[PDB]
Amino acid sequence: MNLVLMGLPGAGKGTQAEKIVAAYGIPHISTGDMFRAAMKEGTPLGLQAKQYMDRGDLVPDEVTIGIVRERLSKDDCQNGFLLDGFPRTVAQAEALETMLADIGRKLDYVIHIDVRQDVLMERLTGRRICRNCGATYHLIFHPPAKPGVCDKCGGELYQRADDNEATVANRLEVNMKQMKPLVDFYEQKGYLRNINGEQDMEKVFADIRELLGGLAR
Numbered sequence: 001m002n003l004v005l006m007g008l009p010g011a012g013k014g015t016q017a018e019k020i021v022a023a024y025g026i027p028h029i030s031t032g033d034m035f036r037a038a039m040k041e042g043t044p045l046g047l048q049a050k051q052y053m054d055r056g057d058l059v060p061d062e063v064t065i066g067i068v069r070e071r072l073s074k075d076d077c078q079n080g081f082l083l084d085g086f087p088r089t090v091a092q093a094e095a096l097e098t099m100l101a102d103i104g105r106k107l108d109y110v111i112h113i114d115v116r117q118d119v120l121m122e123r124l125t126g127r128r129i130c131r132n133c134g135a136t137y138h139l140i141f142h143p144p145a146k147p148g149v150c151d152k153c154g155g156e157l158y159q160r161a162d163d164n165e166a167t168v169a170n171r172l173e174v175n176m177k178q179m180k181p182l183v184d185f186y187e188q189k190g191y192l193r194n195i196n197g198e199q200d201m202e203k204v205f206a207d208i209r210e211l212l213g214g215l216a217r
């Protein structure tokens, strides 16, 4: 089972990806998470991606396609995988088709989680992350027990660098221009499936699981 989770910033890709991989046990491949890992390590890629990420811009295609090609070749992807946040440009999508073909695979579904831009703005700005364990909270939609404190570890909660309002507005605009044309690209191949992301987390998961059910049928 080869899947792609596609959505504008804050649509709920990670939230759902975590639920999906816990149910099937396949790898969760997130380009944003890989770039952040490279930044922490201090690698050449991490240094370059930092500048784009901090501004809310997309990292250039060649660089991004490259780290994905490397990740997809590993043995852990033999039983399938979940791509989160890639592809997000038409060219990354063309690159993905060929990249998969090289390892004898094709996508099953490209799950488009649709949410209104005004809600996405709120999803991102109110998001808070634990500095110790990475647990995610949301001041509006799902706050911690105690303000600024992580329920799991008692750690410090903070706002991701790119989650401030000005950077969010940029993120939304560039992703809307680059990512939205992918709806028609995938609809043409028959891979596209739309999910209403403006529902409670478990309900969104059930619509996804319902879709995934048609694979085992």
Ligand SMILES: Nc1ncnc2c1ncn2[C@@H]1O[C@H](COP(=O)(O)OP(=O)(O)OP(=O)(O)OP(=O)(O)OP(=O)(O)OC[C@H]2O[C@@H](n3cnc4c(N)ncnc43)[C@H](O)[C@@H]2O)[C@@H](O)[C@H]1O
Binding pocket: 007, 008, 009, 010, 011, 012, 013, 014, 015, 016, 031, 032, 033, 035, 052, 053, 056, 057, 058, 059, 060, 064, 084, 085, 086, 087, 088, 092, 123, 124, 126, 127, 128, 136, 137, 138, 141, 142, 171, 197, 198, 199, 200, 201, 204
């Ligand atoms: N392919 C690529 N090409 C080029 N450059 C690339 C690239 N991929 C990455 N990059 C670069 O890396 C950067 C970061 O990428 P990335 O880290 O991928 O950011 P993103 O795609 O913009 O979106 P998010 O990760 O922040 O949100 P998400 O959809 O996962 O939602 P989440 O589940 O967290 O949910 C968000 C919040 O909402 C909450 N939430 C989720 N669902 C619900 C719900 N149903 N109801 C209420 N709250 C909800 C969560 O609790 C959370 O607080 C990019 O800006 C770019 O610079």
Ligand SMILES: [Mg+2]
Binding pocket: 013, 014, 032
């Ligand atoms: Mg994410």
Ligand SMILES: [Zn+2]
Binding pocket: 130, 131, 132, 133, 134, 135, 150, 151, 152, 153, 154, 155
């Ligand atoms: Zn914590």
